[PDB]
Design a protein around this ligand. Structure first.
Ligand SMILES: [Mg+2]
Ligand SMILES: [Zn+2]
Lengths: 101, 143, 67, 55, 138, 144, 81, 189, 72
RNA sequence: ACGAGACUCUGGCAUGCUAACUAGUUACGCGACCGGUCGGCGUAACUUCUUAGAGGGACAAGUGGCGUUCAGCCACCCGAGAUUGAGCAAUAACAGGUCUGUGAUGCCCUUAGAUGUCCGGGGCUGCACGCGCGCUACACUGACUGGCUCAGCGUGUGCCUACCCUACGCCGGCAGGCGCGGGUAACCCGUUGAACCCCAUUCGUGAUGGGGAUCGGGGAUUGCAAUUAUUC
């Protein structure tokens, strides 16, 4: 199938942007037409906990946070070229999922 | 304009006095078994005008209102609308009204006290029966 | 309170003493000059330094400055 | 017999059926997102997990 | 000939599509004198009342509004309509007419053209809201 | 001219459509209309005693505006504040049976039909009826 | 057969606080006096190019009453990102 | 042609107090259709003097907890009682409100002793802004407790309160409180 | 202290409702209720009846406030 | 030099850039009603609206006063904004709290009719009374009953681990029940049809239709058990 969608998830923005730019550059050096990086809304995981290990003192809370950023790339290519582009030693921490539509 | 035909300022129904100035469906609420919803359903199925006050209805209207109040299931009032559904002893669905019916059926606490159930014991001791804390609440009338 | 910290003031004084020829009375040219000749890791700090440089240029315009 | 009695009480929903995956305690447990750790263990391992303080 | 200029208040945002037409003003498909509270109807009519029907006579305006609260959707609609007329006049008529309409609108109300930046403040622990604190006892 | 639902007042449109439905005499009403409460968060029965026709008119108008609704959607439309006594108030949904019977009565008038994606929608006959009633409302005291 | 484990060396041991903490731990476990071990770890960290460092040891250092003992050198920031 | 609501002009309103002319905003830049403008008059000191007097009254009406933030209700309560002031007096309601503001503001009152003290009070003069603020507060309070536990609706209590204050009558709560404050200031002179 | 308002008119109070209320500058259910010792519901009904007969002019109507004035 | 500031996150502005069938908007076709209304259908433009990256943008910078004419303060113009809110936070100290968070712990105590551990049943709520945090009120600027119309933050099917969010259809006042689907989620719930508020209605100044404690009789739901009454 010529419809290939790459989903990129990461907790670090800089790594995700570097990987997306590298992937699109590789897909454009080859004569492939690629739909640009669609940026899904960021998911913010929140946990609020009491600071103390006990129940004593002024009630203070830690507000922890995790942020998940999601990118989508659609390209028209045979699967072999997609495999060539994907395996380019991507930056650690970025999860890449290639799906056939 | 007040009705000349002896506008009943005070009306006696079930050994209770209802006020003729009160709008119907709220005047008959004074009966100790009838409140708001029961009154409205009774008057709807008795087909009387709800905008009238209790003093402008005739004797026949009040009579049929009393009968439909005392025989709800005979006029297609649903069984879930009553306050004595599946009554213990005689498993009859009914609506208990006023002195002699509501307060006497209230005197089913003696059943609980005779079997010495925990709820009956809490009733006998004047305490609270529905599992509420008694530390810091209800301290009125307990010296 | 718009009181500048010693970081801003010493940075501005050194910048002025070193590059007085390139500077003037314009904030928007001074900030470009500062970002070209200096390494200020923040944009807000750069803007504060450029603003104080403009103030000091106006001050030297009508005489001397102790710094 | 003891075989049918030992640990025979149902443990499927209450606090007796959940515990910290680190310290095996049963109090102050965080079930959100599948962490299944108590509050103190979470404060201890939050940076390793990836939860960092921003605001 | 169209502009699509929009305006906001709190979370409510309204986009006004203004094209060459014959004086139609609708909000979410309903005519202007039908918006909900109807106590602030004059707040909606302020642009056309200030500028006159003659200036809106050559345009059709259709406003799509979504976001938080009746009283914000109002003020968002009026901001969008004012800015849409200003932009249409600037792009398709001249700078002088734009100047006069902008002067009238700004003199009457700055919020007709420039959005209010105020937003809800966060809640901090230790109190029911942004700055209120729970009762302290000794 | 030409008048639709969206260029007339919705309250008097609802009143006119309810009058039309009652006058038609083809809408089947349940036998418990004079006993039910319309919501758990209600305290009394409706005051009108013709409330079924008004509710049918409201439901038909809603299906006109945003089609594809079913029970649950209409139950959420007619939900409201529930006062829990000495407890704080909370949102509460409307009666499911009244919404289901209103929708089932609107069909059979050939004004409402099931939609493919699940739910209810207005039939072209229903759209025409609502638009004619809207034209009547507009030609009425709305503007003479 | 899918998981596998390498093992590499730290570029600069003197600049890894976990490594220095382990070194101090196993120095104290070896009977070395607290001050000698702390000062040695401090000096090794400073000689490795660190801009500054701080070693704190707390507990029953001398006697039945606990106390804390701090060794600092160079520059050390505390606030901000 | 910017009549309030859609019926009350401002061209005929005369403040005629000189002292409060700069602090009652009703006339030309402060002629608006509605007493509801969002507005940011509390951001900087003295700006509330640019707020129209009808909006100041409307804001002062939202009081005693249960009515906090309900400004649409209060603009309705002003629209009514303007419709009622016109019926009762035959004059422009804006003129009646302005006259009430003039009449109900204290001119002197007492503070704690002078430079310092903890025994008695010393008389001092009132700022025009504080005059207008206190007038609005007193008029609103008088209306509020006239309508409480009474079949007389609000927008009737407020209308009669404003009418009495415009007349200077002692049937007004605001006039009584103003006289009380002024007399106490007189005694502590 | 406790006021005792009527719920329906008597001939004396139905009088002084047909030749003085139509002369008030302001006619309101609360005003008529206080000046005729009648309940709010009766006052509203009487004012609606007077307006139906053309003796009263409606100035404004609202769910919370209805205002009438004399026909002059 | 540390702390303050700087810093990071966050709120406001960009018709400028990058670019989107898991967001749309215009336009054009095809339909449904009386040019208009279409969260009716479909496909070009494109990115204002939506997302989220880069960069820009504000500095007391401009003007006028006050100041040693300095550091700065006040006011005004232009401006999206002329003080957004948090996070982190020094030296040093407390016999502050926590051994009941820990396979963190030193010393004691106990260790087999056990202070280990399961398993029944009680308790932790028990009520003359005192004291904190609170919820609902004392109404008419309100209750009731219909009608109308607007959000945002976010959470959804699990290592063990049983337990998810729910559209639509039907049955039942109701609480619920029964079938059928979607969703591991900008894809489904959902266009989150929130409440107050708005509009109309009835009440009519009194413990009143305010207010809902207490208590009786029925019906369901979750659970292995609901009585001391889980909840509805
Ligand atoms: Mg800081
Ligand atoms: Zn743990």
């Amino acid at each position: 199938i010529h419809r290939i969608r790459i989903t990129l998830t990461s907790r670090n923005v800089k790594s995700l942007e570097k990987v997306c730019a590298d992937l699109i550059r590789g897909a454009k050096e080859k004569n492939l037409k690629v739909k640009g990086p669609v940026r899904m809304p960021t998911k913010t995981l929140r946990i609020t906990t009491r600071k103390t290990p006990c129940g004593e003192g002024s009630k203070t809370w830690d507000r922890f946070q995790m942020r998940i950023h999601k990118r989508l790339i659609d390209l028209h290519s045979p699967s072999e070229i997609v495999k060539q582009i994907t395996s380019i030693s991507i930056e650690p921490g970025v999860e890449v999922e290639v799906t056939i539509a | 304009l007040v009705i000349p035909e002896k506008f009943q300022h005070i009306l006696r129904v079930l050994n209770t006095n209802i006020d003729g100035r009160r709008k119907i469906a709220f005047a008959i609420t004074a009966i100790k078994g009838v409140g708001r919803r029961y009154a409205h359903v009774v008057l709807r199925k008795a087909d009387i005008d709800l905008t009238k006050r209790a003093g402008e209805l005739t004797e026949d209207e009040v009579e049929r209102v009393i009968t439909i109040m005392q025989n709800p299931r005979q006029y297609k009032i649903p069984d879930w609308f009553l306050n004595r559904q599946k009554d213990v002893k005689d498993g009859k669905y009914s609506q208990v009204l006023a002195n002699g019916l509501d307060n006497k059926l209230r005197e089913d606490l003696e059943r609980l006290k005779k079997i010495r159930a925990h709820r009956g014991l809490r009733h006998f001791w004047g305490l609270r029966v529905r599992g509420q804390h008694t530390k810091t609440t209800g301290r009125r009338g307990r010296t | 309170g718009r009181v500048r910290t010693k970081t801003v003031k010493k940075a501005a004084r050194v910048i002025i003493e070193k590059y007085y020829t390139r500077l003037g009375n314009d904030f928007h040219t001074n900030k470009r000059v500062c970002e070209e000749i200096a390494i200020i890791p923040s944009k807000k700090l750069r803007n504060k330094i450029a603003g104080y440089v403009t103030h000091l240029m106006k001050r030297i315009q009508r005489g001397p400055v102790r710094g | 017999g003891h075989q049918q009695l030992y640990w025979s009480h149902p443990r499927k929903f209450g606090q007796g059926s959940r515990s910290c995956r680190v310290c095996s305690n049963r109090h102050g447990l965080i079930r959100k997102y599948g962490l299944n750790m108590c509050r103190q263990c979470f404060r201890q391992y939050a940076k390793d997990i990836g939860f960092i303080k921003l605001d | 000939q169209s502009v699509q200029v929009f305006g906001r208040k709190k979370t409510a945002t309204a986009v006004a599509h203004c094209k060459r037409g014959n004086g139609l003003i609708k909000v979410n498909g309903r005519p202007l004198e039908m918006i909900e509270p109807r106590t602030l109807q004059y707040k909606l009519l302020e642009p056309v009342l200030l500028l006159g029907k003659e200036r809106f006579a050559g345009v059709d305006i259709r406003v799509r509004v979504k976001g938080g609260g009746h009283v914000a959707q109002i003020y968002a609609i009026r901001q969008s309509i004012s800015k849409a007329l200003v932009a249409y006049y600037q792009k398709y008529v001249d700078e002088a007419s734009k100047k006069e309409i902008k002067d009238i609108l700004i003199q009457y109300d700055r919020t007709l053209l420039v959005a209010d930046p105020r937003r809800c403040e966060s809640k901090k622990f230790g109190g029911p809201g942004a700055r209120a604190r729970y009762q302290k006892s000794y | 001219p030409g008048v639709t639902v969206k260029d007339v007042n919705q309250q008097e449109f609802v009143r006119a459509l309810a009058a039309f439905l009652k006058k038609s005499g083809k809408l089947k009403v349940p036998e418990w209309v004079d006993t039910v409460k319309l919501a758990k968060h209600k305290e009394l029965a409706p005051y009108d005693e013709n409330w079924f026709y008004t509710r049918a008119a409201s439901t038909a108008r809603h299906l006109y505006l945003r089609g594809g609704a079913g029970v649950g959607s209409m139950t959420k439309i007619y939900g409201g504040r529930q006062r829990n006594g000495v407890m704080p108030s909370h949102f509460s949904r409307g009666s499911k049976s009244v919404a289901r019977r209103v929708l089932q009565a609107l069909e059979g008038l050939k004004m409402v039909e099931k939609d493919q994606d699940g739910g209810r929608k207005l039939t072209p006959q229903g759209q025409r009826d609502l638009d004619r009633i809207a034209g009547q409302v507009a030609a009425a005291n709305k503007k003479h | 057969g899918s998981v596998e484990l390498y093992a590499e060396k730290v570029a600069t041991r003197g600049l890894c606080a976990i490594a220095q903490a382990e070194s101090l731990r196993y120095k104290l476990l070896g009977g070395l006096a607290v001050r000698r071990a702390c000062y040695g770890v401090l000096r090794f960290i400073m000689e490795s190019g660190a801009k500054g460092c701080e070693v704190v040891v707390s507990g029953k250092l001398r006697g039945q009453r606990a106390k804390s003992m701090k060794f600092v050198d160079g520059l050390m920031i505390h606030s901000g990102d | 042609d910017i009549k309030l609501f859609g019926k009350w002009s401002t061209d005929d309103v005369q403040i005629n107090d000189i002292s409060l002319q700069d602090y009652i905003a009703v006339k030309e830049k402060y002629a608006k259709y509605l007493p509801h403008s969002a507005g940011r008059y509390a951001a900087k000191r003295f700006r509330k003097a640019q707020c129209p007097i009808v909006e100041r009254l409307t804001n002062s009406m939202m009081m005693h907890g249960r009515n906090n933030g309900k400004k649409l209700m209060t603009v309705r309560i002003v629209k009514h009682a303007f419709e009622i002031i016109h019926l009762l007096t035959g004059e422009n309601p804006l003129q009646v409100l302005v006259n009430a503001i003039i009449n109900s503001g204290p001119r002197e009152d007492s503070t704690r002793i002078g430079r310092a003290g903890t025994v008695r009070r010393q008389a001092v003069d009132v700022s025009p802004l504080r005059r207008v603020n206190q007038a609005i507060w007193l008029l609103c309070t008088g209306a509020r407790e006239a309508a409480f536990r009474n079949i007389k609706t609000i927008a009737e209590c407020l209308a009669d309160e404003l009418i009495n204050a415009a007349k200077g009558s002692s049937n007004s709560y605001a006039i009584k409180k103003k006289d009380e404050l002024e007399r106490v200031a007189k005694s502590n002179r | 202290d406790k006021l005792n308002n009527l719920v329906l008119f008597d001939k004396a109070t139905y009088d002084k409702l047909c030749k003085e209320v139509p002369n008030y500058k302001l006619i309101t259910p609360a005003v008529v209720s206080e000046r005729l010792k009648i309940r709010g519901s009766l006052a509203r009904a009487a004012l609606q009846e007077l307006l139906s007969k053309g003796l009263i002019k409606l100035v404004s109507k609202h769910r919370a406030q209805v205002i009438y004035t004399r026909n002059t």
